[PDB]
Design a protein around this ligand. Structure first.
Ligand code: CA
Ligand code: ZN
Length: 603
């Protein structure tokens, strides 16, 4: 049993049982009784080590315990758990030495009850999940198994807050092969939240580091402010302002209303979406001519300022032939009708973006070669046929920019000036690992190659879009398809995982523009309230791949956007401790209040 006191915090670490605990400002947190730090293969505790060494350490930078673990059959690794002098933070390092996952640090005890002490997780826009919450919240119920750099982990942190206002945030400083793990039992007494780490390309390769910061007199607002600061203290908090200094078009997205509609549909036979009764469900076409007149009419009706995202615009048809997604669909009016539509949009003060796809790599593609595809760490090629274009694998992001550069050249060759562009999935799904000797790529590398893809667009004054908003992309992404809450991605019938809190826009409102769902759910929540509280852009039309007081509703949300769209969301609060009735405050003092009993808002 070692003990360390440094810079206002105290660390405790048990020599023999491995359970560690920290304290600062008189609040103690502790590893749960009965959860071992583990390794996995086809589960061994750390204590399972044939040899275990512990060395007390004082460096000029902090103090703590280094531990070596050999054994298990031959394998070895190391942990370093220390207090940083400058700040008071505790840092946990797992250190390869030479295995499927690593679950370490072991989760902190946050049992139990007391409806007001909450877990904050980062699964899409925030989820504030109180310890007494009725519904079960597990990792199986979280997108992509709770994996950072995805929809299941918008930001590489989680946090636990007590009624006391005594919190800890946990920041993953090595996210690219990592995620968090959540166990909140239905109505549970406790919520346990823990970090997990996977090998990169078959091997734990690089050290993995978690940074804990204990907070006192703490808000959920404040917990997000800590991360924001961490991010900027590392130069990855890219504002719209910074983006705007390079491409002022960023400013033209404020106040805009979103129209998402498409041109061609063409479900293939091998596709999961194919049924033989009937075709015509499998084939549909709306022409450029029709979308022209659509956009015409929306202006005439007073829709206002608009951005048109255009699905299915190329010849093979929506979700077909990627990356050979050329030419612009003939049967809808070829390059010409497309050219004419784009012209028309600009001609009435409206913006336009293409829908494109560079991860999904179809066999039906004109240029398909298995030589350009992903190979997993076991050297296999992944295959599915979930989507419209049928059989596919994934294109190694190592080759992604080649294809972005080639395609958008062709597009521009035909007098088409894209305002924006949407490269699909990049910002929602995980980075691939690629083991192909001819283009080896780690998950870290994959996000950089995706960002290189975005940056080519930015270089051509073409704004940037993708599915969702995983923070890796923050420096190269202008806007998204949405940054919704988890509950908006489930049937409104589904029991929810917690209180919706805008944890993300708390961190990035002033960095990435998001359109929002405008739906009303019968017998419940109007999704306009969430757009408001999140100071976002409104959807007017949202035609899915698989007007009626709308304009009047949009123009409310749009107007607030123009005022606030680039500003920091400084505060979000729950009016009088009640989960419904929430307030969010922006940089310029604007307070959007939203009553969830009354379905009302106040601007
Ligand atoms: Ca789309
Ligand atoms: Zn590759």
């Amino acid at each position: 049993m070692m003990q360390f006191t440094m810079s206002g915090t105290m660390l405790r670490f048990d020599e023999t049982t491995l359970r560690f605990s920290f304290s600062r400002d008189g609040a103690t947190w502790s590893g749960c009784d009965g959860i071992e730090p583990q390794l996995t293969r086809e589960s061994f505790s750390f204590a399972g080590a044939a040899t275990v060494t512990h060395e007390r350490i004082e460096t000029g930078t902090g103090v703590g315990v280094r531990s070596v673990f050999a054994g298990f059959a031959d394998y070895a690794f190391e942990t370093y758990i220390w207090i940083e002098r400058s700040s008071g933070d505790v840092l946990c390092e797992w250190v390869p030495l030479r295995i499927d996952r690593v679950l370490w640090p072991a989760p902190l005890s946050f049992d139990r009850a007391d409806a007001h002490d909450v877990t904050l997780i980062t699964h899409e826009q925030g989820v504030m999940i109180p310890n007494s919450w009725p519904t079960e919240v597990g990792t199986d119920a979280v997108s992509f198994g709770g994996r950072f750099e995805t929809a299941g982990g918008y930001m590489p942190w989680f946090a636990q807050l007590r009624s006391d206002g005594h919190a800890y945030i946990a920041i993953c400083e090595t996210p690219w092969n990592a995620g968090y793990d959540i166990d909140h039992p239905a109505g549970g007494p406790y919520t346990h939240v823990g970090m997990w780490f996977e090998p990169s390309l078959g091997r734990m390769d690089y050290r993995r580091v978690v940074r804990y910061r204990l907070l006192d007199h703490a808000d959920h607002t404040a917990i997000c402010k800590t991360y924001r600061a961490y991010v900027n203290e590392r130069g990855r908090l890219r504002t719209l302002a910074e983006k705007a200094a390079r491409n002022p078009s960023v400013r033209d997205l404020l106040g805009r209303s979103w129209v998402h509609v498409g041109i061609k549909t063409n479900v293939q036979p091998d596709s999961s979406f194919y049924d033989p009764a009937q075709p015509g469900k499998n084939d549909s076409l709306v022409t450029f001519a029709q979308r022209e007149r659509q956009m015409r009419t929306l202006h005439e009706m007073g829709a206002g300022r608009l951005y048109l995202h255009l699905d299915g615009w190329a010849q093979p048809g929506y979700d077909n032939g990627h990356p050979d997604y050329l030419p612009a669909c003939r049967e809808a009016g070829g390059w010409k009708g497309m050219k004419s539509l784009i012209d028309a949009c600009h001609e009435q003060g409206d913006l336009f973006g293409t829908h494109d796809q560079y991860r999904d790599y179809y066999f039906a593609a004109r240029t398909f070669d298995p030589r350009n595809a992903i190979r997993l760490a076991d050297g296999t090629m992944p295959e599915h046929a979930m989507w419209a274009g049928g059989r596919q694998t994934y294109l190694c992001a190592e080759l992604a920019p080649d294809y972005v550069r080639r395609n958008f050249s062709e597009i521009a060759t035909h007098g088409i000036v894209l305002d924006c562009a949407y490269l699909d999935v990049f910002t929602c799904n995980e980075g691939d690992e690629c083991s192909h000797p001819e283009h080896r790529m780690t998950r870290r590398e994959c996000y950089e190659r995706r960002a290189e893809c975005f940056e080519y667009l930015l270089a051509h004054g073409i704004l940037t879009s993708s599915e969702e908003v995983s923070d890796w992309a923050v420096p190269s992404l202008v806007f998204c398809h949405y940054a919704p809450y988890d509950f908006q991605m489930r049937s409104p019938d589904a029991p929810r995982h917690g209180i919706p809190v805008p944890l993300y826009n708390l961190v990035y409102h002033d960095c990435v523009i998001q359109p929002w769902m405008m739906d009303r759910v019968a017998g419940g929540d109007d999704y306009m309230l969430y757009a408001l509280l999140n100071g976002g852009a409104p959807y007017l039309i949202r035609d899915a791949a698989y007007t009626e007081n709308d304009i009047e509703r949009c123009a409310v949300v749009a107007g607030l956007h123009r005022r606030v769209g680039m500003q920091e969301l400084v505060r979000h609060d729950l009016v009088g401790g009640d989960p419904l009735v929430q307030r969010s405050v922006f940089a310029d003092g604007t307070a959007v209040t939203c009553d969830f009993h009354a379905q009302t808002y106040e601007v």
